[PDB]
Amino acid sequence: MPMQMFMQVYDEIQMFLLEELELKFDMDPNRVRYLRKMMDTTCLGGKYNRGLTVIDVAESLLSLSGARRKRVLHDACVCGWMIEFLQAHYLVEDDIMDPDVTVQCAINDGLLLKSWTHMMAMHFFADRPFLQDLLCRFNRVDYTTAVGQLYDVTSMFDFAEFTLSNYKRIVKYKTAYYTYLLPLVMGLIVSEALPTVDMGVTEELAMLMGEYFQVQDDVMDCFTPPERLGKVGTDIQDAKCSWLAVTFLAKASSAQVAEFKANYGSGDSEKVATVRRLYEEADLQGDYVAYEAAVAEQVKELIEKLRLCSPGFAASVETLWGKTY
Amino acid sequence: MPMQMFMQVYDEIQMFLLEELELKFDMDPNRVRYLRKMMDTTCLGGKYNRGLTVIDVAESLLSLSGARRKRVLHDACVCGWMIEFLQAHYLVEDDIMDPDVTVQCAINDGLLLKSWTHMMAMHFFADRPFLQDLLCRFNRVDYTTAVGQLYDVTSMFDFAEFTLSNYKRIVKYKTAYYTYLLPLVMGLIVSEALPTVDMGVTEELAMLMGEYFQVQDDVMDCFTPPERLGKVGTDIQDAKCSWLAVTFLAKASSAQVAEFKANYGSGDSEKVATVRRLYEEADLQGDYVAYEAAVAEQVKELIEKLRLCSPGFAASVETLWGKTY
Ligand SMILES: Clc1ccc(OCCCn2ccnc2)cc1
Ligand SMILES: Clc1ccc(OCCCn2ccnc2)cc1
After folding, report:
1. DSSP run (H or E) holding A262
2. CA torsion, points A181, A185, A188, A190, in degrees to nearest 10?
3. End-to-end CA distance of chain B
4. B287: annotated binding-site residue?
5. Which numbered atom of ligand 1 lies nearest the CA of A139?
6. How many C-beta atoms lie closer than 10 Å to residue B5's C-beta?
7. Which candidate, B304, B316, B318, B322, places its Cα nearest to that of B53?
8. For chain A, first and last CA: distance in Å?
9. Dihedral angle at the C-alpha atoms of B47, B123, A126, A182, nearest 10 degrees?
10. Beta carbons of A26 and B169 less than 8 Å apart
């Protein structure tokens, strides 16, 4: 029922965006169908975990607080697609990083997806009292992610920033603010329950779940094979500031660091194999299990602290925590 | 005095944006100075014609309608820099069209410049009654330009769209809505005189000045040498939908069209020279003078129509019209 409603609102959002281009933007049907195929290619495909979280938060607050129910659940789907659309916007900008007409259309697709988030927000929420407050928080979170992508890309151009605290800063700005905080806030805004929750504990629960997911995603990037992971692990070649790197540099000898600095960030499949060997000679996967368990306990405890002031909110957070755990 | 005020507000805007990153975004000084050098590189350099137009409109309405004057002129400079910042955002996206770290930073610079337009608007206008109305019109004009760039880039991928009307559509959405309409609207919004002007005539005057500038810029792209123009003319090689092309196809014989379709859009310097030869054998520059004079007369007449309902507004439009003419 939630997913069935989510894809139905996608038809409602896509119809408005394309018809507006046909009627009020003087666009020919050829480019209109071109944008339909482009929208479905970029927005549809993933698991929609960021969007469906907004719905799960909204349905918990209306029943754990008749015509008002249909409005909030509809606003949640529009807010959920705002994230999925902006998620596709960043993914299109990633394909560029990896008279040419296929690159010009790629940049244009990224600008349109970003613009469509404002169009659907200024439309379905034109009469909502939170349109001005939602767009401001939505922009700063988009600003935060662009800043976080600067922390991550320039993590080796200025090993001085290979610290567990800087790793927290990257995951916080690059990932945690858009995955584990943004959908929770948009669920409280459509339900008109934003000031009725502990934002400090909500923020604290957001960064910890991002730390839990990013660390697990770094171990799978290095150890899970490409057929079981679904992608080719390139964090070692890209010299990324992963959890495996900052943990290795702390418990490695002065030689294992020198052998690490001479083999890290190289495309040689044998140097990367020498880096994976050092990661296992350091028993990092042993520390990986205990590290996630420590963060997992902090998640379970902070859910109870937010439960004393927001009972129905914690039920949705436990569901979001169950997705990563 | 206007330009001296404009660069002074740039210091005020840059100081807020960078300090916010240092205090509320946990950014190290290395990246802060990196963003200062990047901001000055992209935003500073041009003639600032789009930004200064907002100031020229604001100063005409406060004297041709004491503490209220300083507020409107300050809002005009912030609104003027919103355009210059977003202008640099599109320019950065153009350099991309023409683990690599120099391309990742290019995409990141484009996202930050776009985000900074919202940050400076949500800051300096946090207490203005037009913050919600300005951001909505600012986004749709940004949406319009991204749509116009789709009309222009795909003008030969779907010579069927090489018509004088489609040329108007490209210039309208790609150029006229951001150069000759956006600065005029932001000047009326900061002066609280938006509903006191004929928007239809204001829109009509906007597209005509864009048509006047784009046509003149197409002739210089083909005939003005690179040292006098300042750039290498590549519209013929790129197979652009320029005014010289749509005018040629209308007055060329069935052979001159075949010789045009076989030499247009090619990088061969001899095929391009064969296209320039056809442009002069058709006496297009003779039609170019009379075409601009016809549009120039429509500009002078529409200034009088807006003068009957807005006297001080026309004085600023005549100044903006004097920049292109
Ligand atoms: Cl407000 C908002 C901010 C960021 C969003 O997505 C982040 C995607 C970044 N990314 C992920 C993989 N490659 C790039 C969605 C909404
Ligand atoms: Cl709202 C707004 C919309 C568009 C703006 O700039 C248009 C620049 C497009 N361009 C020009 C040369 N290459 C790309 C500024 C403000």
Report:
1. none
2. -140
3. 23
4. no
5. 1
6. 17
7. B316
8. 23
9. 110
10. yes
What's the CA gap between A208 and B144, in Å, rounded?
40
Domain containing B235: what range? Answer: 1-325
User: Residue A104: which of B97, B144, B239 has the nearest Cβ?
Assistant: B97
**Is A84:A50 a contact under the CB 8 Å cutoff?**
yes
CA A231, A295, A287, A178: dihedral to nearest 10 degrees?
A: 30
Contact between B186 and B54 (Cβ < 8 Å)? yes
The closest alpha carbon to B252, from B218, B214, B211, B280, belongs to: B280
Please state the separation of Cα B314 from the chain's center in Å. 20
Query: Can you tell me the distance from the alpha carbon of B325 to that of B323, in angstroms, rounded to the nearest whole number?
Result: 6
Resolution in A, one decimal? 2.3
Q: Let me know: does B63 contact B33? Beta carbons within 8 Å.
A: no
Nearest-ligand number for the alpha carbon of B181: 2
The answer to whether A88 touches A106, Cβ cutoff 8 Å, is: no
Write the DSSP assignment of B189-217 as a string of letters.
HHTT-STTS-HHHHHHHHHHHHHHHHHHH
Residues A107 and B97: their CA atoms lie apart, in Å, by 8
Looking up tokens 């993933």, which residue turns up? A46
Instruction: Report whether B56 belongs to an annotated binding site.
Output: no
**Tokens 């919103």 identify what position?**
B82
Q: In a 10 Å sphere around its CB, with 0-12 CB exposed, 13-18 middle and 19+ buried, how is residue B142 labelled? A: buried
Nearest to residue B26, comparing CAs of A80, A147, A76? A147
In angstroms, what is the span from residue A131 Cα to ligand 2's centroid?
26
Cβ contacts of residue B73 below 8 Å, gap of 6+? B5, B55, B58, B59, B62
- How many other CB atoms are there within 10 angstroms of residue A54's CB atom? 30
Experimental technique, in short, is: X-ray
Contacts of A77 by beta carbon, 8 Å cutoff, 6+ apart: A5, A6, A9, A51, A54, A55
Closest CA to A242 of A173, A309, A132, A163: A163
* Tokens read off for A235: 């964090």
CB < 8 Å & 24+ apart, contacts of B39-48: B39/B14, B39/B113, B39/B116, B40/B14, B42/B88, B42/B89, B42/B91, B42/B92, B42/B109, B42/B113, B43/B10, B43/B81, B43/B84, B43/B85, B43/B88, B43/B113, B44/B10, B46/B84, B46/B87, B48/B3, B48/B6, B48/B80, B48/B84
Whether the CB of B145 sits within 6 Å of ligand 2 = yes
Distance between CA atoms of residues A58 and A194, nearest Å: 12
A155 closest CA partner among A165, A146, A143, A166: A166
Strand locations in chain A (E): none
Rounded CA Rg of chain B? 22
Asked if A35 contacts A111 with a C-beta cutoff of 8 angstroms, the reply is: no
> In this structure, what token pair is assigned to residue A87?
């998620």
Nearest Cβ partner of B146 from A112, A150, A173?
A112
Of A289, A278, A274, the closest CA to residue A245 belongs to A278
Measured CA to CA in angstroms, residue B216 lies from A153, B18, B173, B318 at distances of: 42, 39, 18, 18
How many folded domains does chain A comprise? 1
- Other CB atoms within a 10 A radius of the CB of residue A95 amount to 12
| Chain A contact set for B25 (CB, 8 A) | 144, 147, 173
Cα–Cα dist A71/A74, whole Å: 5
Distance CA B260, CA B245 (A): 9
